Amino acid sequence: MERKHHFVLVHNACHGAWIWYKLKPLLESAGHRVTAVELAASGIDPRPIQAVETVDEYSKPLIETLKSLPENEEVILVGFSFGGINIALAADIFPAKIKVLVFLNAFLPDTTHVPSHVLDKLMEMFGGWGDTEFSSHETRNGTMSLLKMGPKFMKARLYQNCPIEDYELAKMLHRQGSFFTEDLSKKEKFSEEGYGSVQRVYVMSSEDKIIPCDFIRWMIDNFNVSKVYEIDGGDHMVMLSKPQKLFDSLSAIATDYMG
Amino acid sequence: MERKHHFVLVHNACHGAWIWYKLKPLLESAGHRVTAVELAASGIDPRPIQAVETVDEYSKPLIETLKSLPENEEVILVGFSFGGINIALAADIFPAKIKVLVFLNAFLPDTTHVPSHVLDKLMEMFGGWGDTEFSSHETRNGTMSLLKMGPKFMKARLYQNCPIEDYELAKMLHRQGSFFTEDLSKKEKFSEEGYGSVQRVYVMSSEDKIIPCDFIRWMIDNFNVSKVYEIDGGDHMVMLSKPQKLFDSLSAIATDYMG
Ligand SMILES: O=Cc1ccccc1
Ligand SMILES: O=Cc1ccccc1
């Protein structure tokens, strides 16, 4: 049989490691290892997002996961939505630990503009926040912008193709979060020698109603990838609406980086 | 159309509102209203269990839920496992807001012994805790016995008939909890005028490896219920392994307490 891989899965803002509950057993049934990280102030972490003030603090559990890998192990690192930013931060630290970066319906930052660039572009473009609640919290180093999705927003823009149970589950577990836009604006550019040296691919859902198909080409035009995979019928929450097709895409990717 | 009901669902220790993610849409599709309470330090509740030092504090979000209901509304109150204790505490405060208590694979306390009596009785003969981690936390209320389920124990004794996806979900969401057995053993006995006045039924799973049949019969013999319903093939986590059959049970209870 084929050599199997270790997939490290990184969830999106306002969510947690739970989002991967359908995909993880699919990958593990095929022989692969899976670590679903839980970011700071996310999921069941009993720390509020207000206490996490920086994207580096947010991302620490991911950093710790990579640091703990044995010597010479490499992983397929999958970042979902805001998780794109977390995986890029990690790739700037431990590029040699990452076989390939999988940007799943994700923000794909570049190594030219300030790290908030793609997030600022999406906020300018996006008009469907609906009943999302936006708020601020003042820290000793400035304003931190926060968000809590509304349930109408969730249903229309993230989960519209998911089973109703998955939506009910998300209603019971989503949390106030942040895209750390101010912090990321002040941070040093991602580097060519770290993040830009790592192999990367894009996996997009054909019915993503938060990260539109054109915005994805714009990002990939600003910063190219080796390959784009498309999941037919996926909503944004594609590991919930089309977990078997996502498994297919990640199995194709693993075959492409035969490790 | 038969008139519908408002179900209030109360989860077990070390879990949270999320466990009802399958049952809740089934009930709502049939026309009912459902409120899935998140107890203190449970699920995404921002407190650790160390900050929740008494069972009254633990139960506060259920008490608040009942307190907030409009005048003369009555609910079907469903307590799962340690949630039998919470719903009894609630019934002793707002008996007139409860149409019927539903003890689902639950501790059924009485009005003769201390409120810890049925827990103490199970704990003495419980069988293996496996890889469950026990710890203590000293407080101004005395010493709290904490536990955190281990994953082998969950698989073997709670989730054995559940889809692998639900088991993985639970691994990503379960938390350190407590059964508050010290606090319960010093609380005043549940009252005959409050708790004892409220209609009750018991719903049991046939394959619950935590709360076995003979123990349930002993509890009911100490404290009678109006009717018993059995879910054939259910594990302890019956909302996850047989949610349709749990729906059918609750639906039958709702027809029995019509009007
Ligand atoms: O995809 C993640 C996300 C989170 C909060 C709001 C919008 C999108
Ligand atoms: O039913 C809930 C429960 C939780 C921890 C251990 C045993 C049972």
Ligand SMILES: [Cl-]
């Ligand atoms: Cl996100």
Ligand SMILES: [Cl-]
């Ligand atoms: Cl319990």
